Design an enzyme around this catalytic site. Sequence first.
Site, PDB file in Angstrom:
ATOM      1  N   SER A   1      22.292 -67.428  -4.667  1.00 27.62           N
ATOM      2  CA  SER A   1      22.070 -66.933  -3.320  1.00 27.62           C
ATOM      3  C   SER A   1      20.574 -66.705  -3.122  1.00 27.62           C
ATOM      4  CB  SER A   1      22.840 -65.625  -3.122  1.00 27.62           C
ATOM      5  OG  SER A   1      22.528 -65.018  -1.881  1.00 27.62           O
TER       6      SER A   1
ATOM      7  N   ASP B   1      42.639 -68.749  -8.476  1.00 22.91           N
ATOM      8  CA  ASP B   1      41.506 -68.076  -9.107  1.00 22.91           C
ATOM      9  C   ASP B   1      40.403 -69.066  -9.445  1.00 22.91           C
ATOM     10  OD1 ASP B   1      39.830 -66.398 -10.478  1.00 22.91           O
ATOM     11  OD2 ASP B   1      41.119 -66.201 -12.241  1.00 22.91           O
TER      12      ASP B   1
END
Length: 330
Positions: A199, A35
């Site tokens: 992004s 994770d």
Amino acid sequence: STGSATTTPIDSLDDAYITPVQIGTPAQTLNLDFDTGSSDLWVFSSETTASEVDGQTIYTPSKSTTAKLLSGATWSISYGDGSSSSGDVYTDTVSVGGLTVTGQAVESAKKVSSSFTEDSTIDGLLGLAFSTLNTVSPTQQKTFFDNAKASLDSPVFTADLGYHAPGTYNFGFIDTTAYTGSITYTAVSTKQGFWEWTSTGYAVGSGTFKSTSIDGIADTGTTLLYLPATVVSAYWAQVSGAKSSSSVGGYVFPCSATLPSFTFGVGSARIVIPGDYIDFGPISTGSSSCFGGIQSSAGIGINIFGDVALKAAFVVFNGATTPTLGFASK
């Protein structure tokens, strides 16, 4: 040193991925959920409340010659999905794919929430976010990656998740045969303890890419792609019959639909998520309505590039003094 381990989806939807981890001496192999959105390595154990164990493999520290109890230490974690676990703390030898860390904090669960009990395939979590998020008290402990770093050939790990197929976590090297084209690297902020990046935009299907900044985290422990409501609405508007259902908990669509791809930007480069990766199947057994793999992050407080996004790429988690993320197509 290096390590290399195969990671395998737990079910037919790629809800999560499990990776074998050796703990203790002699080795006890548990299947852990790696994770990159959390920083605790915790396991089902001989100390876990018996009624809360249902099929998991447990760690038994009393059978390990190298286990050491961290006196007085406790841990307690709550995840974004509302699940939780807590317990006490050992250190022990932990190996992943041939890479060994001695004295790794292994957090032994005394209590786990129902979602963990109900998932027989996941024996615990191995956190790979920054150690600043680790929940051990009174003294925070380091992640497996943080402990391994100085010994690694290069201070990196890579995630290469499969679509309905196994994939690979590598430590300490970049497998240049595992991707197409070049890896584009992008800046990371560690201010919130995550692999947080920005992004450069998105496209829906064959649409023209929209240049726009989207801050989010690279999170292998989250199944879906969670993005701003504007972006998600633009995606589902291209799917006939798609709608947001408050009763179901997100966007659903007719199972007969052909889903468009979704592209996200990494610098001037682009990662294309095929439409099939966005299909999470019937909302309930036998339904003709299906659950979408791109959902709104509104009310999470953060955008999450979870497995739906990450499995479309080869991803480098660069733990150099100034961390970065790299993405390549594959």
